[PDB]
Amino acid sequence: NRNPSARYPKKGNKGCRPVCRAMRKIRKRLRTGN
Amino acid sequence: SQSYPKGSFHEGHINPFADVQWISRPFMKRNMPRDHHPLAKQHTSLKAVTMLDEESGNHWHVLDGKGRSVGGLAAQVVRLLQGKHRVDFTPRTAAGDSVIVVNAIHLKMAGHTWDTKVYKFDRKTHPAGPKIITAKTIMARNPAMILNLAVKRMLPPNRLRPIMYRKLFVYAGALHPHWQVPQVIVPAKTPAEVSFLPFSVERADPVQAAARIAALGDRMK
Amino acid sequence: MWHRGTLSLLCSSCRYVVRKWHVPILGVDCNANPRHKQALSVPAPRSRGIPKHLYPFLVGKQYPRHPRWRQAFTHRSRMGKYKPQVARNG
Amino acid sequence: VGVLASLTSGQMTTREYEEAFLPRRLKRIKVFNTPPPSELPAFFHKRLDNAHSNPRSILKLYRQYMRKDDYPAYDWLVRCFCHLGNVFGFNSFWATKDKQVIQALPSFKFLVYDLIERKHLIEARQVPRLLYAFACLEYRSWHLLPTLLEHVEANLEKWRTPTLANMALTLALLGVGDDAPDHNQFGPPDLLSRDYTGLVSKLALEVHRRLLALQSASSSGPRKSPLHDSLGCMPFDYAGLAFALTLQGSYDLCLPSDETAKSTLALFLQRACEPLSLEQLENSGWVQFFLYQTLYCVDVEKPKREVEVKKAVPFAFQKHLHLSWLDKILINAQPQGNELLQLDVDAALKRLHITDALINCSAGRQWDEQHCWFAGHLVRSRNLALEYDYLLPLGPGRPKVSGWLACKRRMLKAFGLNVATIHQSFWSLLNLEQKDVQLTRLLAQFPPVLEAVKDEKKAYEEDRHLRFQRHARQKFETWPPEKLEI
Amino acid sequence: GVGGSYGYDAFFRGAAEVLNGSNIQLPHLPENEEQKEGKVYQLHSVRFPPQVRRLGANYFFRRQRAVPLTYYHHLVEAQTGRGQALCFVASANPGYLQSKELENAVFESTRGFACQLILEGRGVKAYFDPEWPNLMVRLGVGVKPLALRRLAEQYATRAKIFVDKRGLLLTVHGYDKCAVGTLAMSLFNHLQANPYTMKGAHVAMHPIKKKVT
Amino acid sequence: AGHKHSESVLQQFYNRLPVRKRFLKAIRKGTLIWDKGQVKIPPIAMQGYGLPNKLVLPHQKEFNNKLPKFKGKINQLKATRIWFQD
RNA sequence: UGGUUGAACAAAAA
RNA sequence: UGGAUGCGUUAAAAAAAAAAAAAAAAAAA
RNA sequence: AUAUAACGGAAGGUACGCCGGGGAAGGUCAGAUAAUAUUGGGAGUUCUAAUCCUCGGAUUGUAUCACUCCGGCUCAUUACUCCCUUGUUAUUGAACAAGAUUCAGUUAGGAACGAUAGUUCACCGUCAGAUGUAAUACGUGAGCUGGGUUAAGAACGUCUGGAGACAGUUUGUUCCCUAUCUACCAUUUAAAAAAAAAAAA
RNA sequence: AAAGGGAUGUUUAGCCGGGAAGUUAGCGUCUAACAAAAAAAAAAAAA
RNA sequence: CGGCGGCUGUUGACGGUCCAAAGGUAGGAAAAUCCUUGUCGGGUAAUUAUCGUCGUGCGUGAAAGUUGGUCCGACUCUUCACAUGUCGUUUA
RNA sequence: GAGAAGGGAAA
RNA sequence: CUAAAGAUAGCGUGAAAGCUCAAAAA
RNA sequence: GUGUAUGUUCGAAUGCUACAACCACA
RNA sequence: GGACUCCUUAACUUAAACUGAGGAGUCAAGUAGGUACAAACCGUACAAGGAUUAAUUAUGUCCAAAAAAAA
RNA sequence: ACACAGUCGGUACGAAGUCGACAAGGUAGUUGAUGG
């Protein structure tokens, strides 16, 4: 949605950013849906 | 009432399953540049000429832009303008040579760029935002701008960019007007002779040849 | 024309075509029924997308990046205040 | 749907996840370690025995063997070359362009170089295989040819009769061993090899000698099949021998042992036709083409033994071949697809604006209802026929045409056309402008001797005066309009 | 974008809608007769008219094809076979020998192509005012005629329009298939019948469906 | 941008694209896509046919590749239903 | 492939 | 003998137009 | 024996208020919900797709509901084939006329006033025969007003014993700033027409 | 240590909540997920 | 100083039953009380205003006073008239 | 060849 | 010519008529 | 192609309103 | 009576840099590099001090910008 | 100054002479590497 938490990591971040949501939300959806 | 202009996909096949879904050109097939019929086959391109002037220190490159990609040529031109090919390169001066590019009308952009691309020019505090001009419009009005706008934004954004920009000269046509710089498009020369015959010849007997010519003559005419 | 987000052949005479509209558009043409003439012009908005380089940290079981070791490492012999109380024969 | 719920639900790990936390340049684990071969010959022999159909696969086998060893087994090299030739051996659906591409490939050149380097290891039992491969690939190797021909001449009395026949046919196809003197030497001008004139004639004479010896020492031993003779030759071998004699134009050949000696060509035709009926002839294949070509060339050139050569073939056979010539025989026997030199010269002609040049156009005598030969190009307004020689020269700057093109040259001479042959060994050295200049010079020697026939698209000439003024605005002359102007 | 990022459907759902078909109510049956036989291919040959020679190397030998397309020209000087000029066109794939370009090459130089438009209704008539190319078509009693000399000028020297004695059949003939088709389809676009009144033109064998209020 | 103080990341990405506003409108509506510097027609999902391998997950690639493949043109396509893969 | 082309068509291909 | 304004009069055409403020082979003023 | 069960052991008001300290229309989220199609169902003589209503899932999105110091006037800026005007000839359950549903631009010109009312959105009346919708800190108060609304006075109803109070109703009640910077609109001789510019050795 | 009126002084609670509240207060007490050197499932056995 | 009912049968004159010291009477009345603009009528092209009216709804209420007559007010409001730059819309 | 989703523009 | 032909799969009619498809042959 | 306008429903229902059956041709 | 990332969870609309737990990592109290731009992600043979030598960290190798395509 | 206005670096004399200076020059103190 909006940048501060919806921004994806980039090559060099190893899939994490200080205030990011996208990765954990995607993993939760993959695990148990929505 | 008004509607969209006719693009390149209105004049050919479209294959949605291919990566290159349709062929795109700067103009329509009938509007593409060509050589005047009687004034053709008189010239040939050396494709690149270099002039060294050790006294003034201002050297020249003259390049043929016919059939080259805009970005592929722009990167090389930026290298030459900066002078990074020189062992005495310095970031704090326009340390490169001068460059002339000919045949900007014949520059190529791969894919659907000719139909899709646009160029923006900022307008300070203007409520309508930047002025946007079409790539086809730029190709119709001034083909040199296509190469110029790529080279400018490939150059570093420091205060030396205008100097190297000023040291660049682009032209749509084959010949440039510079007084004391050689041309890359030059008059053609006769092909060099060879010491061997590529073909052998054997002559039919005259009587049989006469018979055949006579037989064919009435059947034709 | 029937403006759709998807195209389908409704009868034996339907066929798929490309139309040169404002842009290239997919569609269906039919000799039998004019109502079978379709154009794929109003699909739902496309998704944001997931970059492919995030796959290792998205798909599959994920284990903590930094291991839990301190609690198992705890012991009195490594603490200055408590080492004297340790007894090897009592 | 391959979703792999085990992974997607979060129960198992992925290779990518595991490798995202390792150094980028670790070496993958070799899951299965099997001992590598100790002997390369047997390994690659097994692989070649598995590979017979794909020239890509054969060349890949050779490239891997080369990467592993700098001196691969010579027998394996010979086998690889034979397989590559058999991939193009005379009954396939390949175009000549594919053979040219294979010849141009660097790997093929490396294989030929490896063969040349140790050419001294060639045994007498492999010469027919190499000659067959050369004929099939249309690659005449003047480096290797002297050694092979020396073997052939040395083992003359030891070859099998069908082997002699096949070797004669292959040599005639390549254009070697003809009766023309000073035209059968190999090597550069400063270092010329032996003269191999009459080799095919000696092969045919050996076959004739054996056939005559049969009359004195006949036997009734078992035959391989109904179509095999006492010497083990089929009708195809005799037809090919006759075709080679026709290609070299040795019509009057005969065994010198007797003054009253029948024609060797007549003997070959008779023994090719003896075991064949008409139903069998309909399916014989190349035999039909060989027989009809022999008869047609004999008729065209009218040699001394024309009557005997004609009497050799049954009249019913002649009638069947004549009536079936235009059905399948010639079309199935002519080269298929495209030739690169032909395409290049066609492009040159189009550039020069020769609009009456007909590709693969036949010619014949004024009274022949059927044509048996096709010229590469027929410039019909100039009475000229352009032929193309894409074979390797006998040496640097010493080109020579194949037997096919030599026979075609003689036929076109008899028909009354001029023949101009382009040799690729010289043509490839030129560039576009030099090619155009030389082709113009060639055409200058044969000025237009007739008017050129046009193949114009039809049109309604009577309307040539009509004018379409696109952008002429619609005129509103009267209100209300009496006529709705478009 | 595609190729660097997965879509939501392909990532979360694995693109199951692709295989979620019902398999009944098909517009066509599947091809079940292939059977992956691996049949014996053959070298098919056809004897086309010699006008096929108009299509030269650019068509026969320079186009990229899966298998070779052999071409030869037999130029010799009731039908008996031998003694006529023709073109041998052969290939291992029969589909090549059914190409429409080969037939178009002959028809362009021999006989061309033709189409017919049929007019119906009261007061509907096509005529010349007074002669070709002053083609006029009236689509009723009170309807002013349509002037169509511009199309004749457009396609002059390559197509012609003939009118019937009764002024109800318009035959477009020509020597270029694409041009003839475009001319006929403009004429049809422009004389098309009103389905409620049925006054106007229709393409032969493609009648317009009468509609009722 | 402009009077819209804060917008979505995707909307900003669309706004920054250097193409004509009408091709950009097609991209917004989903009839075209921006990919590696080019505006293209989106990939087509055909019922009963395998997708292009690039669009499926690495573990699903083999299964997708084993499916039937269409190698014709849009006119020959007999698929019952088709839509843009997303 | 054809200025044939506003929501319209023809040719060729597989 | 006059001025301003509209509640008065006229035009609604040109945009490569109307017009403008830096002639520029001058690459270290 | 004792009270600590608040079990480490019970009066209220302040809108007259004062002092010290600290500050909630956004930023974000996306449940309802909005757009797009799609699935199932129900209407449409017959008909699942001319057209209408509704249900589920999908993607996209935030009009409405669930970290400061209202309305109108004036001046506006931007988006959406968007309210009228365009696509002869898309589809139509399209005779015509008046219409309906989308899709499409080199985006072209335009859509008047009032009664009650603090109002917005609305209701009613006239003209016209062209509902437009949304955003811009629900644009704009160092540009204007101050009708509603949230201080001191005072009154009615209601609650308490009372002082007092009410997301009850009313009447009265000081709306500051000479513009430094950004922005914009106007505006501007030049080489010189102020002073000075003194070398070479 | 009585009663009534008037003055003076003091107090008038914790936690969640704009607030009113509702409920609640010592002690004891029910509801729990983390993994394959938890699978002879890289390592072992056998050879 | 203060207070002045509830659940029910016959729209209920008239009964049943519980409670209470008494169960709010007369007279106002959509009000400075109630309330998004209650019904009907006058004024208007159009009346969330105002006046009269109904007692429909919420209700008020009798010297902590109820209902009225005339006159009065730098008070809050309705309406008619006047020349009117308050205004369409501004100018000298 | 990739959120290449900072700008140019590349197979 | 052989062989095949849904108490009907798509059209069509107020109802009929008529075309196609399935099957077989080539 | 043919028993056949198969039976019931229906003012009718002739492959094609809707249900039943879905047999039959040396 | 702290913040964010990760793993496992309760509450929430399987919402929020939401609230509340159990453990590791950084910040807090840690510079200079990468990740486009003001903590919490990656990486460090982590910063006493000076210097025109060297190293495969993350991560790159068309240009802005350092870094391969002889014959 | 583009600059919280600083920090690290930052131009390499003369030939600007001339009665100059291995193999070729066609005598320029000019020239040698390069056919598809």
Ligand SMILES: [Zn+2]
């Ligand atoms: Zn259809």
